[PDB]
From a paper:
Here, we define the 53 unique GUSs in the human oral microbiome and examine diverse GUS orthologs from periodontitis-associated pathogens. To examine the structure and function of unique GUS enzymes from the oral microbiome, we recombinantly expressed and purified the following proteins from bacteria strongly associated with periodontitis: L2 and mL1 proteins from Tannerella forsythia (TfGUS L2 and TfGUS mL1) and an L1 from [name] (TlGUS L1). Although the core glycoside hydrolase family 2 (GH2) fold is conserved among all GUS enzymes of known structure, two loops positioned adjacent to the active site influence substrate binding and catalytic activity. The presence or absence of these loops and their lengths have led to the classification of microbial GUS enzymes into several categories : loop 1 (L1), mini-L1 (mL1), loop 2 (L2), mini-loop 2 (mL2), and no loop (NL).
L1 microbial GUS enzymes have been shown to be potently inhibited by small molecules that uniquely intercept the catalytic cycle to form a distinct inhibitor-glucuronide conjugate. These inhibitors are selective for microbial GUS proteins and do not affect human GUS. We examined TlGUS L1 with the L1 GUS inhibitor [name] using the 4-MUG hydrolysis assay. Using the initial linear rate, we determined the half-maximal inhibitory concentration (IC50) for [name] to be 2.5 μM for TlGUS L1. To confirm that [name] intercepts the catalytic cycle to form a distinct [name]-glucuronide conjugate, we crystallized TlGUS L1 in the presence of p-nitrophenyl-glucuronide (PNPG) and [name] and determined the resultant crystal structure to 1.75-Å resolution. PNPG is a GUS substrate and initiates the catalytic cycle of the enzyme, which [name] then intercepts. (D) Active site conformation of TlGUS with the [name]-GlcA conjugate bound (salmon). Dashed lines represent hydrogen bonding distances between [name]-GlcA and residues within the active site. The electron density associated with [name]-GlcA was generated from simulated-annealing (Fobs − Fcalc) omit maps and is contoured at 3σ.
Residue numbers in the entry:
A (entry chain A): 16 to 165, 174 to 385, 396 to 623
B (entry chain B): 17 to 165, 174 to 385, 397 to 624
């Protein structure tokens, strides 16, 4: 379960296997014909990491249903066999079968979290083939959820039917790497928490290991000064950090925590900070925070969902330019490269699972018994929560877990589905951070089971777009009536989505849907209400940027609710928010 | 010698790209020796990337001088049993590389690779890797910067490019650590080929360091050995029966496996011939017609930085459009792109960094003492390094020595003759050489006529002259191109185009509209299609790209057939139709 980010250390190789791989669409016979046992014949070339759907100009490739095969050569030095050799897949979307020289090494379900496998040294030949089969199919058992049966026409080919509003980008989304550790004793996991009481900042550590050896830990400032250290330690302990500088939103500070175990060496960046919900306040380092930011997507052209590190950096620069302090990983865990950069840059993150589309009625009810047609995602939902927290537990930037986006939480049985998942997240997070689910707009919002479960109420609301469109006076009144209910509960609540589709270059001085001016007026109307509610502690727009979706009559070449275009150009509303967020402090707004 | 680093049974490959520390030089960075300690108060910058567009700061974008990149380098101690090498695929424009505060190497030239061994004794348990990067350009750099060439005093000193693309700088291409055996290893591989009936003879020269035995083997993609010679020394030749030739849009690559001592290296290799004969450009002895573009390495937000998903997209669009070729205007491109073009069957005109060798657009080629251009020495080095890097690529069919130098002025022949001689001496395959000719009133005095195997012309009939008078453009185009056609040698367009803002339209000829771009091209083809010696059309440009700011640059250069995010303008569809009806071979036979 433990999944430390692979790094080059004095004891660990790191070999990136990214590049140009061979690529072949399956036609239904690829497994039967055992394509993984030889070189792919009559194949294409496809960049890795990337989604495969938009690299070529083929609708057949973009809209493909089922499996594809990736393959590359793997000629490695024999001296590596003296170490433990691990193959790490940062993400393969959605499901994967991994083969070395025709031998199946591992399988994985879940397109947005890492997995790894040791390569048995008996399998390594002088020349090797690495084959990765990737499945794109979605249904009532996957996260995200695909629909099954939900002027009629018969489609030419079978297609996935996303139960979610983003394109089903698939492939080897994030890097594949070979890494090594010592064979006989190595570090398997590191858990760090912070204790700030009695005016003494301390780091508590727990170091999980394999084998028998001696453990040591040191904490170092940016400039390399050791501020605490001990040798021949226990598996758990605490270190006092004198003069500790706390990690703050938009003012990051990361210590370097160096761990040694036998010959193994591993360094973990770490920000010291506290998070707690108290009353109607979201407290970071005991100060009342106000979220300013966005729901995002991992979406760029042409790699789709694929890791784009230049654009990760551009995006954080744009958020700081705009005055934002935060974002949510809608609607799946993001790359570790993004998470580590957010730690370095001081961007606060709401870390969300892949659980979007858990809703069969947007008559079989979503949370009916599985044997009567109810949703089949709970078991996997548990695994995603475990794996997400295991990967991201040490990040200062992560302040809250989002268990699901827009599930059927006003329907019968939702509390029963979600209670074990909230209990699991609270059990597994060593920092005991707030947990939430992101609430769909529903007529019976007072019956939303988030009220019984969440530490913060996170609302997706479209007053002025999906209701009251082109009637913002009505939108304001409808917005106030509902948000006054939420405010009456005395707990922190926020917007995690609100927006209006906006095509750059469309304009009107008079309120008109899809124009840049209407996007601004939409936000002004909503803020007239939220700025008067003391328990409203955050605003995250939908969306940071325009992004790709499945095709249909209400998607103008994707979702156009971005403040920025897909190539990151600011609409009128992006300038509106730069001005607004320039006047709102990170702390003490309410 | 600069073989592309690969993972082999004898060679580790460790990519050091990622998030690096980054600091602008404030004028004290060398004096205060920032390279000896962790960079303080630093930003973060992705590597590989140009740094100019990552943030929102004009001071960063328009910075003049040096910046410092840095990262930690904690490497496994048992790599000290190997030879450890740091490869910089490209650092634009000049670099100083430090490990632990010791200067290990320096490099001039922003678009070709360089490397340095790390001395074992310098490696500590924890190491710092610092790269200082200089962006300054002048009369001694390639590309050339100007020096003195309602007036206003600028706020800050800035580079003055003598070229029409933005001066994107930084760690443009990946930084990697690799290893080879210490005692004996392969330094370079040179391959040439000759077709005798259906048997191909591959002549090899394998350069090595140390004492060991050399072996070469040739394998099909599927893995069948088709030739092998052992204990062969440095030079030799072998034969392949019924060889599959590499063809434009029908690539075929063999795998050439070399062993020397414990060292092992695999080189993909396509077999093909290139020859100019009469007015024909012959590939595998058939008259080729170039269909394609001048490109740039340009995407948002990495600028010039390696972008492998976009490289794959661009080739896909090229094949969608019916193109077969492009030119690496105006600098060598990434090895990753060049290796993909070998794999995909895209023909390349490989161009040096020599753009802006022109002081009168004092004479350009006056003596250095008298203020003439100071680039010839570095120009020779760029030619040497470019051919050393790319010599084995089947996709490279022609070398371009310079873009739009002052070749109609006195001294030009004297400047270029040693460079053409150098290129022909160093290329084992003896491929055609050209320079790319600037539009010029005295075109019959262009020294390309005395030097080049192919005359490659940049012409803007209907844009920079005869704008909005395409009937006059056609007449003036015909008058000049009938001269070039009378010389009997192959010639082509390497640039022709018209700035076009997507979304601007008119039914009636109007510059900057999508329709005018089409009519501009239709008018030029009316002439070129009638000219026997005209053997290729490469538009300017594949896609819109960033330039310096100015009154004629509508947020960069808009002559792309595609926008910067690779969307097709009307003229992109026009060329898809046109190239669908023109064969790669035998159009003008
Ligand atoms: C089951 N699948 C679906 C989903 C949605 C719709 C349909 N089928 S059908 C239809 C429709 N019709 C009404 C209009 N009629 C003509 O079409 C032009 C046009 O719609 O562009 C109109 O301007 C023109 O004046 C009309 O003569 C054409 C069909 N109109 C509207 N909204 C308005 N939505 C739909
Ligand atoms: C040394 N630096 C440079 C370079 C180029 C140019 C200048 N300085 S100055 C100037 C100029 N004048 C500027 C003032 N201008 C007025 O301003 C409007 C406008 O140009 O937008 C016109 O529409 C309006 O009718 C005129 O009253 C009328 C001409 N005009 C044009 N070409 C047209 N180019 C230039």
């Amino acid at each position: 379960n433990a999944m430390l980010y692979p790094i080059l250390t004095q004891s660990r190789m790191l070999i990136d296997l990214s590049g140009t791989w061979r690529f072949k669409l399956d036609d239904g016979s690829g497994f039967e014909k055992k394509w993984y046992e030889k070189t792919l014949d009559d194949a294409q070339l496809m960049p890795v990491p990337s989604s495969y759907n938009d690299i070529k100009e083929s609708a057949d490739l973009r809209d493909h249903y089922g499996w594809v095969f990736y393959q590359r050569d793997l000629n490695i030095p024999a001296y590596l066999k003296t170490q433990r050799i691990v193959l790490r897949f940062a993400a393969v979307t959605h499901s994967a079968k991994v083969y070395v020289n025709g031998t199946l090494l591992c399988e994985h379900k879940g397109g947005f979290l890492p997995f790894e496998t040791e390569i048995p040294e008996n399998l390594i030949r002088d020349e090797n083939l690495l084959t990765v089969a990737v499945d794109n199919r979605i249904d009532h058992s996957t996260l995200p959820v695909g629909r099954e049966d939900e002027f009629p026409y018969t489609p030419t080919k079978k297609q996935n039917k996303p139960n979610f509003d983003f394109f089903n980008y698939c492939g080897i989304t994030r890097p594949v790497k070979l890494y090594t550790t010592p064979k006989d004793a190595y570090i398997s996991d590191i858990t760090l928490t912070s204790s700030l009481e009695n005016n003494t900042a301390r780091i508590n550590y727990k170091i999980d290991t394999k084998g028998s050896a001696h453990t040591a830990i040191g904490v170092y400032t940016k400039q390399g000064v050791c501020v605490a250290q001990t040798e021949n330690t226990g598996t758990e302990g605490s270190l006092t950090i004198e003069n500790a500088v706390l990690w703050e939103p938009l003012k990051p500070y990361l210590y370097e925590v160096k761990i040694s175990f036998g010959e193994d060496r591993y360094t973990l960046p770490y920000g010291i900070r506290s998070v707690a919900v108290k009353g109607n306040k979201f407290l970071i380092n005991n100060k009342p925070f106000y979220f300013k930011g966005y729901g995002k997507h991992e979406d760029t052209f042409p790699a789709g969902r694929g890791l784009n590190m230049p654009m990760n950096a551009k995006d954080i620069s744009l958020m700081k330019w705009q005055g934002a302090n935060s974002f949510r990983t809608s609607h799946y865990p993001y790359s570790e490269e993004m998470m580590r950069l957010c730690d370095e840059e001081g961007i606060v993150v709401i870390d969300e699972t892949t659980a979007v589309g858990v809703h069969l009625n947007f008559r079989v009810n979503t949370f009916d018994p599985i044997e009567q047609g109810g949703i089949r995602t709970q078991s996997h939902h548990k695994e995603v929560i475990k794996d997400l927290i295991a990967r991201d537990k040490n990040h200062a930037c992560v302040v809250m877990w989002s268990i699901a986006n827009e599930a059927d939480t006003g329907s019968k049985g939702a509390y029963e589905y979600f209670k074990p998942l909230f209990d699991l997240a609270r059990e597994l997070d060593p920092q005991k951070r707030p947990c939430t689910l992101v609430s769909l707009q529903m007529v019976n919002y007072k019956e939303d089971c988030t009220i019984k479960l969440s530490d913060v109420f996170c609302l997706n609301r479209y007053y002025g777009w999906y209701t009251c469109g082109a009637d913002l006076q009505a939108a304001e009144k409808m917005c106030r009536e509902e948000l006054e209910f939420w405010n009456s509960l005395g707990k922190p609540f926020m917007y995690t989505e609100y927006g209006a589709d906006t095509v750059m270059g469309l304009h009107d001085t008079t309120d008109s849907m899809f124009t840049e001016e209407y996007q601004v007026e939409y936000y002004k109307t909503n803020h007239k209400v939220t700025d008067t509610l003391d328990c409203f502690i955050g605003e995250q727009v939908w969306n940071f940027a325009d992004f790709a979706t499945s095709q249909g009559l209400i998607r103008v070449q994707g979702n156009k609710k971005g403040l920025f275009t897909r190539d990151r150009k600011p609409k009128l509303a992006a300038h509106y928010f730069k001005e607004r967020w320039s006047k709102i402090p990170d702390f003490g707004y309410k």
